[model samples]
Target: GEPARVRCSHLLVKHSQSRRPSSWRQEKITRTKEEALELINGYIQKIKSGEEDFESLASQFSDCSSAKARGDLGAFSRGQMQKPFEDASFALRTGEMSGPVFTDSGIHIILRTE
Candidate 1:
């Protein structure tokens, strides 16, 4: 049998420790991992409190190019993503939103769209 596959959208926040510290938003990133954590936490609050929505926030804050697609990373499986990304996405139930998940690319918040 094939391994489980999942479809999701996500917001990525790159910090100084990221493989590519510079993101679309900033030509040079000097923020620490802890600083990235704080930023993600604020976004989480806005999303959970209904003060904002995922697509909007992702487009505004996500470092990944997927942000242009409103954070849509489309479909994927175990081997397609970073180990932590794969693990976290696999664990989500459809329509469930995840907390902070760290990958070398950055910190992520996963939303399993189905």
Candidate 2:
């Protein structure tokens, strides 16, 4: 059988600055890639150390629409998501965590649920 699909949750922090025309102001909670990465690091530590849990953190902070589902991307097979995201999620062992993974949409802090 093919390898079991990975089920994961993540907190997505989208980069705020835009390349759009100056007149189109893009106001956001995180204003730069560095800022978003730093935020992900902070939350990663929180989840790792038991200071916070993944679901709550994702619901509170993630920019993805999946935040409503506590950041659950559900179970996905290889190539189901962007390359970077799929690689990161698949590389993790069950119940393990991942560092910020950059993709075109945003940076993600991933936790492999199973």
Candidate 3:
């Protein structure tokens, strides 16, 4: 059987400014506590509705470097991620999709265990 869980990897991305990102832009990605629930909820709705291709959405919408891999957040330990991100990575039903979870990157819509 597959090893219970798979490794997830990804890079964070954020909105760019003139030549550098602003503090507000920076906070959007880092401030997870204040916005996790709303972002996650919106992303979950997108997945269940099947209104978009996750990969394309990740590439276009995700602020993470995973956008290059289409949002492939590689394997990680429970505490390895931010509260919202880690919880979502592990708690999300296997094969489920989630995100817009705030991080130091930006809005991320992560697809779950593969």
Candidate 4:
């Protein structure tokens, strides 16, 4: 078999969104860690409680451009993403949903689709 692969979507809650000083990048995190975590947890609860679907919530709340694809990052092997993301994603079994995993850019709630 090929190396293990995971198909997952995520909710990215960034701290802030402003222009970068000297780069093509421009999304500073303004929210505190606790605030971001709380927001992400609320979405998780919504999904878990059947208050909303993952795709719908992602579309409404996620910060990643992939939100257009319903937060889908597609199938990928380990090391293809940021370490924290890679570690958390690969650790999940199929159909499992992860809690917020912090990264340099933002917080994430990963859902393993396969």
Which is the leading candidate under lDDT?
Answer: 1
Error of 1 at 4 (Å): 3.8
Query: What are the runs in model 1 whose C-alpha is more than 4 Å off?
Result: 1-3
Pairs that collide, model 1: none
For residues 1-114, write the lDDT of model 4, one tens digit per residue: 225677888887776532211111234556666677788888888888998887788877777776777878889888788877777777777777877776665777887777
Residue 72's lDDT in candidate 1: 75
RMSD of 4: 3.8
Query: Which candidate ranks first by TM-score, i.e. highest?
Result: 1
Model 4 clashing residue pairs (backbone): 15-29, 15-30, 15-31, 16-29, 16-30
What would the TM-score be for candidate 2 when compared with the true structure? 0.81
* Candidate 1 residue-wise lDDT at 96: 66
Ranking by lDDT: 1, 2, 4, 3
Q: lDDT per prediction?
A: 0.80, 0.73, 0.51, 0.73
Please provide TM-scores, in order, for all candidate models, with all chains considered together: 0.86, 0.81, 0.52, 0.80
Alpha-carbon deviation at 63 in model 1, angstroms: 0.8
Model 4 alpha-carbon drift over 4 Å, by segment: 16-29
Worst 10 residues of 1 by lDDT: 1-10
Which regions of candidate 2 are displaced past 4 Å?
1-4, 17-30
